Amino acid sequence: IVNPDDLQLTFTMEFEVTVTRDGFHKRTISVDNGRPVVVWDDPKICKICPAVNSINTENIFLDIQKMRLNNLLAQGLWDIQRICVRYVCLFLGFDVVCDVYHTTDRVRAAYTRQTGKIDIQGSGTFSTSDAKGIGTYMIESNVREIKNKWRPTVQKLKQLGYMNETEVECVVTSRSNVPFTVELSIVTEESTVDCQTVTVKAPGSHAQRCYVTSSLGWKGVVTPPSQYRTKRAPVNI
Amino acid sequence: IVNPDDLQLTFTMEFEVTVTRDGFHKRTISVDNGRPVVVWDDPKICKICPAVNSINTENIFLDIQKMRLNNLLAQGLWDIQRICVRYVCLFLGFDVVCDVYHTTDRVRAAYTRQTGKIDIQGSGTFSTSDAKGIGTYMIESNVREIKNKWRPTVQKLKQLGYMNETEVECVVTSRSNVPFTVELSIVTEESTVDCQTVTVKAPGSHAQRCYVTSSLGWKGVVTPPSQYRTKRAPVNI
């Protein structure tokens, strides 16, 4: 017996690992093409995310990838200083299709499972076997689990990147991984596993309007600008 | 389609790992309850054995065990200085039954899969969950492979521990993992992945007879003793 509510949900999980010959490494879990919610540099996990203990299968998958990259750098690609890989896993029922993306300093490679199409761009050296990744059998084996353990997180994150859940002051702050943009009529961009903040400051210049757009499809403006730093939700347009 | 000649062969593979808090470690592969043919301290592999490359699945199984033991010592058993584990895997067709044996300085534990019977002897501390081992799904998953890749090795090792393949001089040397014993009417015992040698020397004492017994079931004597170190095969009794 399986769950219908979790089988209906369709989302993409994005596992990405970066490794530098110098020593640097970074491995992250993202949801619905958003910003990362789980970050390793114990991981930095978001408040609306599942416990570290309940993310173990995804944890090892990422560690296997660090090792596989450290190994590519250890055996070949000696001029290349920074290799990187991204697995874009789409869940549509109990089946996963993971597209693999690789990036060295001199080459970019993409592969997609059904089309089997390998797109290679760059002067650099890469293997078409390496282009297709590994360890996908771990996500493909743990569909029911990963889906059920992430179903609350993946839709509560969407219900947070909503118009009535963003805070404009022009400093725009939405406590959701869903990416937004701010337009003025200097830009300080940042992040955190829990909050995303973009600030647009004018050096004495009169703007009178501040636009805000979301990747889930919405637009808003906050007018008139006040002398104080007062909090307000975006106003529809 | 499977192989009939490899399905017929019934043998026991014995995977054993030793780890000391001080740093020491030793992981070995044995066959038909004999002496070790593969030893890690690149492994020391026997001449009649399969290539390191064709033993990879058994290689990782052993490494998982080193880690699991290093972990038991890292989280508990602080008075205990040396933990050890042995998996006695019996292959009867395409099914494996692996009995697990553990040994700390203060406790001995045995477990057997069907009877599920856990035998614990000692004053020491052990977990009945730990007693049952892990990673057996690797040998149970790779039956066809392990069997086909080891079928020549497991029976050519038996056909070497034969009477007409032992060399008595009293120094007895049989180039086979099958264990033997030497009886005189000082004893220097040793080993190597390729040869087993037992020497029995007398300080001017007259023996006139030297007995040799094998674990496959045979007995022999070499008489009369010569003044020179001449090589001869055991003579039936």
Partner: peptide
């Protein structure tokens, strides 16, 4: 370790084959 990566290589093959043989 190229040894573990060989085990994972082989495991994806066992997974891809076991699913195809149902």
């Amino acid at each position: 370790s190229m040894e573990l990566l060989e085990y994972i290589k082989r495991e994806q093959e066992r997974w891809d084959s076991e699913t195809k043989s149902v």
